[PDB]
Design a protein around this ligand. Sequence first.
Ligand code: NI
Length: 379
Amino acid sequence: KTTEGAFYTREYRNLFKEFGYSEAEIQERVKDTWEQLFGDNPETKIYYEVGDDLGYLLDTGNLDVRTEGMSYGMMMAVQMDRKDIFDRIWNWTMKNMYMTEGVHAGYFAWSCQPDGTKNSWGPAPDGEEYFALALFFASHRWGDGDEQPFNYSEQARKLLHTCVHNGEGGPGHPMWNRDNKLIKFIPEVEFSDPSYHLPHFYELFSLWANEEDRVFWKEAAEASREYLKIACHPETGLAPEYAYYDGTPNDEKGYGHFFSSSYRVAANIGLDAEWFGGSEWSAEEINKIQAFFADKEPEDYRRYKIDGEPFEEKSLHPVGLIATNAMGSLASVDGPYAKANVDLFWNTPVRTGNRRYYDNCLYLFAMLALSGNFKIWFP
Ligand code: NI
């Protein structure tokens, strides 16, 4: 590590403020972003309330409710101290997504219709890891409820138990390969997705998961840091959406390039550097991604091969790309392009249109992280 992280100091960098933005404008912008996503602002909103006790995040582009969006929404709500929103989302999640039958019992069906109908009985591991951490944060901020499923920390430990141990007495599959400690793209495959690797989350799991797994989680954190070094292109810093355990792109179905999924790598690296400390690798990695985009206009952002070669196809989520590249500045605060990225993001409005969901989730995490408001909530 090259700096001491917020995990040790309990002070979160307000990068917007350090780059010269006023405290009043920053506060306004964070709240405005929240309100545009969770309030009534129908052109821009992604959260929808249902009755007195339910609510969900809608993938506006695919017309479904995704565990990615639900777990994001729970993380957002706990960072904003909004138990009411947190509990609505988590309650919908448990009611409509949690599976008690099939090979993936104990996990969450990745895509549901707005009426709660499962589109699939397959889970998406990046959902599970966000559910668990947001649950731990909920336990810590508010206390475990007495009524299930609001017993937050028990639900978190129980979920992470399944993630590691599923398949031991039965037909299930774990979400992490036990030998290499790497998160999988889905439980029944043996390849991964770089954007799913959250070593900073695993550090916390190594403190708060069932004791029998705390060594595993510290090992998974280290394995995830090593994997990112091999998965990011050495010149451009670009990661593929899917990658084999060997770090190379899995393009069997067109996911071997730098597109929507990959964007989150830079954000993940920034947040890890802020929580657990800078490193040389992270700063250089962010410098590479930012250097790569420095001569490119947002209107012209493309799909790229990880070597930098452009496709005709434009970025489907260019706002999310901007936001993640800016959030990445937390791992290279003195980097040559760090201030330009944060400024570009500052000058980019939240997204409107039917594709806004993904951009806007990335945008709110970036607002939170760059203002010193994406925090670890301790017991
Ligand atoms: Ni103002």
